[PDB]
Amino acid sequence: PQITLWQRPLVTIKIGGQLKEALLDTGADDTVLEEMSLPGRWKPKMIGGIGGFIKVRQYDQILIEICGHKAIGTVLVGPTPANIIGRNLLTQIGCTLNF
Amino acid sequence: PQITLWQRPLVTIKIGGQLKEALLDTGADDTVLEEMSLPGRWKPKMIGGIGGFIKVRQYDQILIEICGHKAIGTVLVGPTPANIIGRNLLTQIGCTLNF
Numbered sequence A, B: 001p002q003i004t005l006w007q008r009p010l011v012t013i014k015i016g017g018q019l020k021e022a023l024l025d026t027g028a029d030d031t032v033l034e035e036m037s038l039p040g041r042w043k044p045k046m047i048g049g050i051g052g053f054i055k056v057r058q059y060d061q062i063l064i065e066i067c068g069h070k071a072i073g074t075v076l077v078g079p080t081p082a083n084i085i086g087r088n089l090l091t092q093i094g095c096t097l098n099f
């Protein structure tokens, strides 16, 4: 598919069995998702953004499915205001920027 | 061009006379550049992201060239970690996400 950028590029992702929407984000290095409790082992982390840093938990090897396309990687869960799909999972789904 | 996202998507921009690099950022509504003097008048604004809010100066109707493509649009200047080109100028240059 081709997403245009008139609206925020939101898509549905299936993660841990359930669907959520998430923003496709070429300027994020990592994927950050709203608070949820996944089974599994995690690590504390801090990630930063325009106004400062926030505390998150890192899960490794999570399968997500972004418009039919699976990807496996690291996800950070924390008190974020949006669910953000960053480049670590976007590379796996073959996604490009074209102008 | 077609840009893959294995590395951070950074381009050279020309603005005010300067060259700079900025990130092409689909997850950003607006464009935020590090502090500079730009010709023109400006209004204070706040913008936010992960971590909170910063104070930015707003300049409207600013010419900017991203990879040899011109846009003319609003640019916010403030103390951002990174120079970000957001969706307000990516649609002028005809950028899409494809996968």
Ligand SMILES: CC(C)[C@H](NC(=O)N(C)Cc1ccccn1)C(=O)N[C@@H](Cc1ccccc1)[C@H](O)[C@H](O)[C@H](Cc1ccccc1)NC(=O)[C@@H](NC(=O)N(C)Cc1ccccn1)C(C)C
Pocket: A008, A025, A026, A027, A028, A029, A030, A032, A047, A048, A049, A050, A081, A082, A084, B008, B023, B025, B027, B028, B029, B030, B031, B032, B047, B048, B049, B050, B080, B081, B082, B084, B086
């Ligand atoms: C730049 C700013 C105007 C932009 N804000 C924005 O678009 N807003 C607030 C409108 C809005 C409101 C509600 C929903 C959606 N959008 C923003 O920060 N967007 C975030 C997404 C977001 C939106 C709202 C709340 C919280 C998050 C978007 O993720 C940007 O890609 C942002 C850009 C950025 C990059 C580097 C440094 C600062 C800002 N990435 C990030 O914040 C990511 N950080 C990151 O990847 N970093 C810091 C690594 C890095 C370092 C240096 C250079 C590049 N990358 C994190 C989500 C992990």
